Design a protein around this ligand. Structure first.
Ligand SMILES: NC(=O)c1cccc(N)c1
Ligand SMILES: [Ca+2]
Length: 223
């Protein structure tokens, strides 16, 4: 997260870290058994880390649970990142508490201008590299579809939206991928891609979760 702030420990209790020997992506807990992330975060051997604040220090509220299965969206296109969404099932159910909690799925899509909370452990610099140990947060509005498509002509599908600031300076970045965009208490986005981070006229692009609710619910119910 570039241009954000330190969230505070366990203030985003649905945020998870995906770990394969190291943190590599975020995700969101949607029930005690299932996490949503980005398809481009797929790999085998994922351990889901819940209850984290400093990802390099055991602070006492963590749960570390191996994934038993991962399900990439059937229409995911790795060349264009269309349908950049996957589901991860936990080998054992998370123990839900105030610091490990699920986030509700949308009942409809969110409007442009709605303010959202984006979070992650990704890079905090817009040129160069610095990774935080603690979770970072950014408040940012959903941008109009026209401003999104203007910024990325030929690359935005109906399964993507932009959020952030056309002036630059505040954005998600490498290492935030797969993590949440929450608006009005619902998981509306997944950190997906962008041209650099926090650059002018290049807002972050997010997977449009509201298009996938039926797929999520049916997939979970059958797996
Ligand atoms: N360009 C990047 O490193 C990146 C990755 C994920 C999200 C965003 N906004 C940017
Ligand atoms: Ca920790």
């Amino acid at each position: 997260i570039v241009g954000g702030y330190t969230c505070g420990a366990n203030t985003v209790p649905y945020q998870v870290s995906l770990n394969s020997g190291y943190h590599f992506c975020g995700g969101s807990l949607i029930n005690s058994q299932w996490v949503v992330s980005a398809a481009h975060c797929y790999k085998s051997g994922i351990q889901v880390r819940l209850g984290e604040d400093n990802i390099n220090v055991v602070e006492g509220n963590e749960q570390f649970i191996s994934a038993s299965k991962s399900i990439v969206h059937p229409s995911y296109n790795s060349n264009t990142l269309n349908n950049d969404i996957m589901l991860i099932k936990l080998k054992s159910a998370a123990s839900l508490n105030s610091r490990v909690a699920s986030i509700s799925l949308p009942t409809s899509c969110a409007s442009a201008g709605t303010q959202c909370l984006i979070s992650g452990w990704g890079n905090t610099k817009s040129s160069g590299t610095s990774y935080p140990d603690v979770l970072k947060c950014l408040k940012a509005p959903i941008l109009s579809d026209s401003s999104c498509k203007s910024a990325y002509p030929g690359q935005i599908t109906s399964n993507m939206f932009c959020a952030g600031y056309l002036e630059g300076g505040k954005d998600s970045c490498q290492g935030d991928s797969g993590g949440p965009v929450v608006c009005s208490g619902k998981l509306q986005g997944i950190v997906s891609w962008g041209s650099g981070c926090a650059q002018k006229n290049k807002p972050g692009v997010y997977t449009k979760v509201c298009n996938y609710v039926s797929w999520i619910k049916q997939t979970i119910a059958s797996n």
